[PDB]
Design a protein around this ligand. Structure first.
Ligand SMILES: CCCCCCCC/C=C\CCCCCCCC(=O)OC[C@@H](O)CO
Ligand SMILES: [Ca+2]
Length: 395
């Protein structure tokens, strides 16, 4: 049958239409409505992409690791942040700061809001006070630690060089490579992917290719209007543009990923749900950084480092600090209510109390909180090192 899921496909696909039709007829909307419509299209195309990636994963598991599907789940973030980086190199000006602000916003929101929210919902759903993670998480923990240690070298220099980007991309490439050699969990299907998997091979694969291309096309035809729409809306209002770039824009990019995470929690799949959020942190804290720095050179057609002013350096430091604390929490392969609430509070406090003083204070707290945990769980760091050591010598 699959009539219900066929209607779910058509319904959300149709959500791209208000913006796509507007593009087709070259109709100009005011700032806010342009943001809503183009944003509606981006979010919609994101679910399509996820539906497409999950079908391909069930189809050919060896080509689509859980890490890769976690990357494809946050494509709108790469496209929006990529747009800022493109403008930064081709035009310059405020877009230089926006590229880093958007990236740090995405990362901190993911942990501060995403990890905490999903954990809290899991608490009420399982009627418990602890979330346990798989042993395979030690992989992402290792790369998270290396990326974070490397990211601490960025506020010092005051920029992100082409070599830095090379490192971050290398870390992710190696991570992906090792994620293929790791024993994945059995991929369940439900909803749209289950209907797509029901179709004969060539029709199934043609369909998700069409979906990928259509959704990918939609995103690329939407991000500029959505990004400029946001910036415009914030300007005619009294709101600082940095708040829109850092907090509002990633919210629209990380929402589809969050919604899918919540869905899997209620279906009693907490482990896989957290695996994706943690792996998504990995790519956004590796590949994303490399991408914006690389794009900064490409759009300018010149070998160039992405500058980091006083503000953005503090943002990166704060983000690295939060990420250190995140790593230390994951070491026991469990997420408790204290740790989740700590992630939430320490995040929103910085957001509700702006200023250079608070950025340094919260940075210090993240780091100082991390050290006793890291010291008490030093065997877990060694274990994470051995996990990677085994994946290398698998064959
Ligand atoms: C020459 C080493 C560069 C590649 C390192 C790849 C492994 C990254 C591991 C992270 C933990 C150590 C991070 C701290 C060590 C990185 C220092 C560095 O090499 O800086 C070079 C640029 O800043 C210029
Ligand atoms: Ca923990």
């Amino acid at each position: 049958d699959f009539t219900k899921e066929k209607f779910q496909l058509l319904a959300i696909s149709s959500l791209t239409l208000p913006w796509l039709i507007s593009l087709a007829f070259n109709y100009h909307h005011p700032a806010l409505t342009q943001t809503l419509l183009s944003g509606l299209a981006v979010v919609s195309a994101s679910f399509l992409i996820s539906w497409a990636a999950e079908t391909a994963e069930m189809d050919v598991p060896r080509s689509f690791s859980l890490a890769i599907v976690a990357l494809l789940a946050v494509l709108p973030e790469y496209a929006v942040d990529g747009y800022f980086a493109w403008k930064a190199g081709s035009v310059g000006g405020e877009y230089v700061h926006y590229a880093t602000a958007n990236m740090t916003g995405a990362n901190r929101l993911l942990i501060g809001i995403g990890w905490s929210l999903v954990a809290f919902i899991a608490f009420r759903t399982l009627k418990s006070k602890e979330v346990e993670l798989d042993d395979g998480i030690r992989l992402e923990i290792f790369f998270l630690f290396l990326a974070t240690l490397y990211a601490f070298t960025l506020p010092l220099k005051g920029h992100i060089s082409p070599f830095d980007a090379l490192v971050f991309v290398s870390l992710y490439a190696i991570y992906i490579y090792l994620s293929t050699k790791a024993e994945r969990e059995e991929v369940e299907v439900g909803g749209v992917p289950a209907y797509l998997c029901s179709l004969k091979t060539e029709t199934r694969r043609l369909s998700v290719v069409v979906l990928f291309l259509f959704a990918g096309f939609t995103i690329l035809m939407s991000v500029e209007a959505f990004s400029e729409g946001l910036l415009e809306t914030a300007r005619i209002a009294g709101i600082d543009e940095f708040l829109a770039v850092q907090w509002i824009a990633p919210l629209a990019s990380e929402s589809p990923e969050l919604i899918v995470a919540i869905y899997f929690v209620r279906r009693f799949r907490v482990s896989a749900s957290m695996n994706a959020l943690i792996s998504s942190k990995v790519n956004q804290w590796t590949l994303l950084i490399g991408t914006i720095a690389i794009i900064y050179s490409i759009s300018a057609f010149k070998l160039q480092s992405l500058p980091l002013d006083a503000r953005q350096s503090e943002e990166v430091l704060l983000t690295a600090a939060q990420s250190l604390f995140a790593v230390a929490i994951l070491l026991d392969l469990k997420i408790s209510w204290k740790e989740a609430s700590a992630l939430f509070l320490l995040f929103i406090v910085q957001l509700l109390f702006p200023g250079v003083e608070v950025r340094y204070i919260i940075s210090a707290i993240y780091i100082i909180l991390s050290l006793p945990i890291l010291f008490a769980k030093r065997k877990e760091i060694v274990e994470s090192f051995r996990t990677v050591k085994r994946l290398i010598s698998l064959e």
